[PDB]
DNA sequence: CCGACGGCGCATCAGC
DNA sequence: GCTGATGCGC
DNA sequence: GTCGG
């Protein structure tokens, strides 16, 4: 971090301007893709032209770095940083369910702090004030070790349902991280096929055990709420849950395990050896897709030996 | 030069 | 009432 | 904002 880490939060806090205030949502990705590639080079920067050399830094970040290296600070930032209205906009945004846009409507009409917002609660929909009555909560990591209890309650609730259920959580945490930003589980059933109330089932019955505390959207095949460990008190969570039928599972599973750079090395992967992968199927290039009972079978087509998720960080 | 860049489920708006 | 668009999150 | 047809 003491390498560029002053880089990589310049690109970041960028990257969110852009998305937040300029509502520029290709220019946000440019900059994180940006900060992304910097964070991962091992060597201290130490000319914008040096940082050009690498993909994803153009001109005009060479220019930022140029002038962050020789002032210590960028001028455009420091000026944003102090404008009431984009900070105000920026900041509201750190709310679930607040984007730009509500963000840049509430600040138009004076609302501009979570005070503004709690006693404005009839211009708030479902999903805000629940994003406002959890912001700390949310913004919380999520220790790996409670991940596991949240895990033990999930695949306990779920058999319990219908133990034809198969439910996998995936994301950072099974791939081994030592903390998650949230929880996502995958799950599916044998009756549920692409050719041919089972969500709800599920939903309601951790709902029943009082482990689903809230509601942001639910739907036939995504849930999206919060949860929290009952106590022996632990931080609300969010929590969402896919429908996803069975011939389509293990691609979903594989996707939504990640990492994201590991996707996007596994899918390059695939395209030189003639196979595209979504998160739904692999079909060969694209015609019809292919039949697939696990995540090896995936690595097969490609010729690629099996990756354990632990080691699927690039 | 200039278009692509994550694609889609759900909630809610705009409009008929 | 409906269909389609937009916002939002991931 | 950067990349590439
Ligand atoms: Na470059
Ligand atoms: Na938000």
């Given at each position: 971090?003491?390498?560029?880490?002053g880089?990589?939060?310049?690109?970041?806090?960028?990257?969110?301007?852009?998305?937040?205030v300029?509502?520029?949502?290709?220019?946000?990705?440019?900059?994180?893709?940006?900060?992304?590639?910097?964070?991962?080079?091992?060597?201290?920067?130490?000319?914008?032209?040096?940082?050009?050399?690498?993909?994803?830094?153009?001109?005009?970040?060479?220019e930022?770095?140029?002038e962050?290296?020789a002032?210590?600070?960028?001028?455009?930032?420091?000026?944003?940083?102090?404008?009431?209205?984009?900070?105000?906009?920026?900041?509201?945004?750190?709310?679930?369910?607040?984007?730009?846009?509500?963000?840049?409507?509430?600040?138009?009409?004076?609302?501009?702090?979570?005070?503004?917002?709690?006693?404005?609660?009839?211009?708030?929909?479902?999903?805000?004030?629940?994003?406002?009555?959890?912001?700390?909560?949310?913004?919380?990591?999520?220790?790996?070790?409670?991940?596991?209890?949240?895990?033990?309650?999930?695949?306990?609730?779920?058999?319990?349902?219908?133990?034809?259920?198969?439910?996998?959580?995936?994301?950072?945490?099974?791939?081994?991280?030592?903390?998650?930003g949230?929880?996502?589980?995958?799950?599916?059933?044998?009756?549920?096929?692409?050719?041919?109330?089972?969500?709800?089932?599920?939903?309601?019955?951790?709902?029943?055990?009082?482990?689903?505390?809230?509601?942001?959207?639910?739907?036939?095949?995504?849930?999206?709420?919060?949860?929290?460990?009952?106590?022996?008190?632990?931080p609300?969570?969010?929590?969402?849950?896919?429908?996803?039928?069975?011939?389509?599972?293990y691609?979903?599973?594989?996707?939504?395990?990640?990492?994201?750079?590991?996707?996007?090395?596994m899918?390059?992967?695939?395209?030189?050896?003639?196979?595209?992968?979504?998160?739904?199927?692999?079909?060969?290039?694209?015609?019809?897709?292919?039949?697939?009972?696990?995540?090896?079978?995936?690595?097969?087509?490609?010729?690629?030996?099996?990756?354990?998720?632990?080691?699927?960080?690039?």
């Amino acid at each position: 971090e003491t390498l560029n880490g002053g880089i990589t939060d310049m690109l970041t806090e960028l990257a969110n301007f852009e998305k937040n205030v300029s509502q520029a949502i290709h220019k946000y990705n440019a900059y994180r893709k940006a900060a992304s590639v910097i964070a991962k080079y091992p060597h201290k920067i130490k000319s914008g032209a040096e940082a050009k050399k690498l993909p994803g830094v153009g001109t005009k970040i060479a220019e930022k770095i140029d002038e962050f290296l020789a002032t210590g600070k960028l001028r455009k930032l420091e000026k944003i940083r102090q404008d009431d209205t984009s900070s105000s906009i920026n900041f509201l945004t750190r709310v679930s369910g607040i984007g730009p846009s509500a963000a840049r409507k509430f600040v138009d009409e004076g609302i501009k702090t979570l005070e503004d917002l709690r006693k404005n609660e009839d211009k708030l929909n479902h999903h805000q004030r629940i994003g406002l009555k959890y912001f700390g909560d949310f913004e919380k990591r999520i220790p790996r070790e409670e991940m596991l209890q949240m895990q033990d309650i999930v695949l306990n609730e779920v058999k319990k349902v219908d133990s034809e259920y198969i439910a996998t959580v995936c994301g950072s945490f099974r791939r081994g991280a030592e903390s998650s930003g949230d929880m996502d589980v995958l799950l599916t059933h044998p009756s549920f096929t692409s050719e041919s109330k089972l969500l709800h089932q599920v939903v309601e019955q951790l709902q029943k055990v009082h482990f689903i505390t809230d509601t942001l959207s639910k739907g036939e095949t995504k849930f999206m709420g919060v949860c929290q460990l009952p106590s022996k008190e632990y931080p609300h969570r969010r929590i969402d849950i896919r429908l996803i039928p069975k011939d389509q599972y293990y691609c979903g599973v594989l996707y939504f395990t990640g990492s994201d750079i590991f996707n996007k090395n596994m899918r390059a992967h695939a395209l030189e050896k003639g196979f595209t992968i979504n998160k739904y199927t692999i079909r060969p290039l694209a015609g019809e897709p292919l039949p697939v009972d696990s995540e090896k079978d995936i690595f097969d087509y490609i010729q690629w030996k099996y990756r354990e998720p632990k080691d699927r960080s690039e």
